[PDB]
Design a protein around this ligand. Structure first.
Ligand code: YS7
Ligand code: SBV
Ligand code: CL
Ligand code: CL
Ligand code: CL
Ligand code: CL
Lengths: 445, 446
């Protein structure tokens, strides 16, 4: 069938029009290997989305696929017992690999992993409130926590990556805080920002939890945590089993050991093949030179993309880690037009602006993507000269601050509005009706 | 290479929940399995009656499922940059043909996420706040609290304990605020007509009726309770759908499923392809003439044999329910567990909660092996435990059956003063609440 035939069938039976069809490039992938994907009509594309970050090593990685198919064929997938040899071997590998990991438990998705981390922190501490920055998943309490402010029905206070807010909240009501959970943003902030958050949480005996579902294999081979940010819990997900569904919650023994009293559970958390896959992923990441070559390819792409935009006179900022770099533009229309056009030249850029190379990339794959980006940017500007400034200027500080707030809820200004919002939120928490709490297990109430 | 004692010690150090993973289950760990049989770390063999905690419907390492999943992984790929794939569309088309309620179908990784999705879509499609619930839907706090009769304002969930008198009164009192009714069908204490009456009440108040068939979907019948003839606006499937590979599905009325865009639901691994290939293979097996009928015959053989073993020892008992999910109810909550722990020694994993789950891979030899183990274990426990093993015959008391239903699944089956006052108290709590205080919803309703 071709694209048009498949989407007509999909519209009738399964597809969400925007999420599945009109918000995405007009192709459907049939197979993929290494850096390259092939659509239903045989057209080939370099992938820069990492399969929405699920893939770190490349498509159909041979050692990962050998390990997963061996488990499926020779032993089985999901057994009557919850422990298995691969689960224990993987847990041992992770506890040896990561400083925070004294025990580790597994789930299917990052959304459920961060929910489990919050559930365990509440059960281990007996406290009600959670302070949050960043995206943690699609449940309502997670999405609301991306916005600055307090939701009494969920027990979550969003703090917008704001250090002044975090310190003021912990001083005001830190005895009520079960945990601080943060998806580290490392374009606008350096590692010291997160070291200060962590040390500040420790001063108040509040667990600090890094949501590394996205950054865990892309800020570095051991994530932001492994770059030297102490934490009591780290959640991993994207990349862990190189596209197979697996998430992990690793951390302090007493937090993980709250599993029994928490009531957490789940039929498929014992599923064995993804655990075999993750063991193979760690073996690749720990092979001398492999991660460094991936970062070299990321730098080659980032440097070339920055050069292309600057040569067109387009204000831009290209930054962040090599395996998860952002391309920040003067407005939210230019990027989408370029990336849509680059699909015509054989590339799937990440249209949210964070480009994701994988370990299978070579210089030829990077340079194919750069050719498409140069040609697409040229065509877009030729056809729509007013789509963005072309005067050679820099991104304004106003655009950078506005982008941070719109993209990830970061409140980076020290102005009247931000200061008033901090005070309003702290007052709302401190003087609330304490008889009204979220539904919690165990109950606190 | 490592035995049970070594594995549990290594696990306690790095991963195990002491009760959930170790002390609360049989003292063996499964290394590999095929069909109805599992083998532990030391080579001992067991017939599985847990269905891998219901994940498995056909049997372990079923050749058609193994072929479909490995072919997709090996020859094409696992998760791609596009969310649509050929197997997703083919699976959606198969399910839309198979099920009356399925106009569209979306997929997720776990049944807990599937039922959460169903509620999110019902609220998004209707613009209404409250959900009425009966039965277990997953491990999130709002799901767990909804198993108890009553109202939690912070979640917007009212548990109604399977009670039709409560359901009708709630819909009359505040049905204009109800986005959906979500029920896990219990078919030991209730018949299909009970669920048809729930569905009819929901239809009269324009409230979506949603069947959580994460457990019952392939075990109440080959098309679940819905396929036996209970109308629904949404059905959630999960256990068995991909024969042990993680996959869940939310299928239902077009306008409810089409709330996906505005709801904010996402989740990356929802596009993962191999489990969808596996589910296509599962439907093909279930639709093969004789396969499901043979599985039900094996379940009847097991249930009939377990009933006569207990009755032969004079233990009052009730063995009933569908052949692929029958309950063994005893006079107290200790006796079954003690028999099942003892039966492990004789080469069976019985389901400790009492709902025994055969799979399509069962044959008479597997059933009879389990019955022989059950007969020996029952004899041993009866002899050793007169404190929990009455041998004086008779039936379960009416009080025991009523208490078991409330404890096991939150069913409020009594028509008495305490139950009626609880119904009225809960309705007054909902109706008289501070309407300015409500759960966080997306899309927002405040
Ligand atoms: C699947 N959720 C898994 C949990 C844990 C263990 C599993 N065996 C299952 O057990 C539930 C029992 O099934 C249930 O018993 C009641 O329902 C079945 C039956 C035969 O009708 C019984 N008759 C007396 C009745 O008591 C217990 N009340 C509750 C137990 N937890 O549930 C699941 C999900 C989550 O899927 P996932 O995230 O993939 O694990 C969501 N919804 C449902 C309906 C189920 O079963
Ligand atoms: C400017 N710098 C940016 C910065 O703006 C910021 O951008 C993020 C995006 O990254 C994020 O989504 C990106 O990842 C996916 C979804 N989340 C998985 C996920 C899950 C649940 O896991 P599961 O249930 O298995 O899906 C849990 N926790 C985390 C941390 C997860 O990432 C798919 C879509 C893809 N675009 C957006 N959803 C929001 C947007 N604010 O963060 C990255 C950055 C580079 O720092
Ligand atoms: Cl295509
Ligand atoms: Cl299997
Ligand atoms: Cl914010
Ligand atoms: Cl063992």
């Amino acid at each position: 069938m071709n694209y048009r035939e498949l989407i007509e069938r999909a519209r009738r039976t399964t597809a969400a029009e925007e999420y599945d069809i009109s918000g995405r490039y007009p192709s459907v992938i049939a197979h993929a290997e290494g850096a390259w994907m092939t659509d239903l009509s045989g057209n080939r594309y370099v992938d820069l989305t990492g399969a929405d970050a699920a893939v770190i090593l490349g498509y159909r990685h041979p050692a990962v696929n050998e390990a997963i198919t061996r488990q499926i064929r020779d032993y089985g997938t999901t057994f009557a017992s919850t422990l298995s040899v691969p689960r224990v071997e993987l847990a041992e590998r992770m506890c040896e690999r990561y400083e925070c990991a004294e025990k580790v438990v597994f789930h299917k998705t990052g959304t459920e992993g961060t929910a489990m981390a919050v559930r365990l922190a509440r059960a281990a501490t007996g406290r009600e409130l959670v302070l949050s920055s960043g995206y943690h998943g699609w449940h309502e309490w997670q999405m609301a926590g991306e916005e600055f402010g307090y939701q009494q029905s969920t027990g979550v206070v969003g703090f917008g990556y704001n250090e002044k807010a975090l310190a003021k909240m912990l001083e005001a009501f830190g005895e009520q805080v079960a945990g601080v959970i943060v998806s580290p943003e490392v374009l606008y902030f350096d590692l010291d920002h997160y070291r200060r958050m962590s040390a500040l949480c420790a001063r108040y005996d509040v667990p600090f939890m890094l949501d590394e579902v996205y950054t865990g294999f892309r800020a570095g081979p051991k994530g932001v945590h492994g770059l030297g940010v102490p934490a009591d819990v780290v959640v991993l997900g994207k990349g862990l089993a190189n596209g197979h569904s697996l998430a992990a919650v690793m951390g302090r023994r007493d937090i993980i050991d709250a599993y029994d009293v928490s009531g957490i559970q789940g039929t498929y958390t014992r599923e064995v093949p993804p655990m075999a896959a993750a063991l193979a992923v760690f073996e690749v990441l720990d092979t001398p030179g492999v991660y460094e070559h991936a970062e070299a390819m990321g730098r080659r792409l980032a440097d070339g993309m920055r050069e292309i935009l600057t040569g067109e006179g387009i204000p831009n900022w290209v930054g962040g880690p090599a395996l998860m770099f952002d391309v920040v533009l003067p407005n939210d229309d230019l990027g989408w037009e370029i990336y849509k056009t680059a699909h015509d030249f054989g590339v799937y850029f990440e249209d949210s602006g964070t480009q994701l190379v994988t370990a299978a990339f070579d210089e030829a794959a990077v340079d194919h993507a750069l050719t498409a980006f140069r040609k697409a940017t040229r065509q877009v500007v030729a056809d729509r000269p007013d789509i963005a400034p072309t005067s050679g200027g820099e991104l304004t500080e106003e655009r950078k601050l506005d982008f941070a707030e719109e993209a990830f809820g970061g409140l980076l200004r020290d102005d009247e509005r931000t200061n008033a919002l901090i005070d309003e939120t702290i007052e709302k928490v401190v003087n609330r009706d304490r008889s009204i709490k979220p539904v919690l297990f165990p109950a606190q109430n």
